[PDB]
């Protein structure tokens, strides 16, 4: 088959978290966001409205697109 060159790495939230301090951003249990930085516990992500902000990785989870 072909090689491809466009594999993004989204995350699915598992708990809600209100955040508006200065450079933080609120998230919800059904929100889905794309990871921009993972250097520390405060991951940086982009929401579907076009903003950005920091959030703790502990409430975020991978997007394996499968469950049981």
From Swiss-Prot:
Tell me which domain of life the UniProt entry assigns to the organism this sequence originates from: Eukaryota
Q: Which gene encodes it?
A: EPS8L1
Q: Which family does it belong to?
A: Belongs to the EPS8 family.
Sum up the protein's function in the record's words. Answer: Stimulates guanine exchange activity of SOS1. May play a role in membrane ruffling and remodeling of the actin cytoskeleton.
The stretch of the full-length protein covered here is: 481 to 536 of 723
Q: In which tissues is it expressed?
A: Detected in placenta.
Q: What is this protein called?
A: Epidermal growth factor receptor kinase substrate 8-like protein 1
Q: Where in the cell is it found?
A: Cytoplasm
- Every copy of the SH3 domain together lies at 9-64
Q: Which organism is it from?
A: Homo sapiens (Human)
Q: How does it assemble?
A: Interacts with ABI1. Part of a complex that contains SOS1, ABI1 and EPS8L2. Associates with F-actin.
């Amino acid at each position: 088959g072909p090689l491809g060159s466009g594999a993004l790495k989204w995350v699915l939230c598992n708990y809600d978290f209100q955040a508006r301090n200065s450079s933080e951003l609120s998230v919800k249990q059904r929100d889905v966001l794309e990871v921009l930085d993972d250097s520390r516990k405060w991951w940086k992500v982009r929401d579907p409205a076009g903003q950005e902000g920091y959030v703790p990785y502990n409430i975020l989870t991978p997007y394996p697109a499968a469950a049981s």
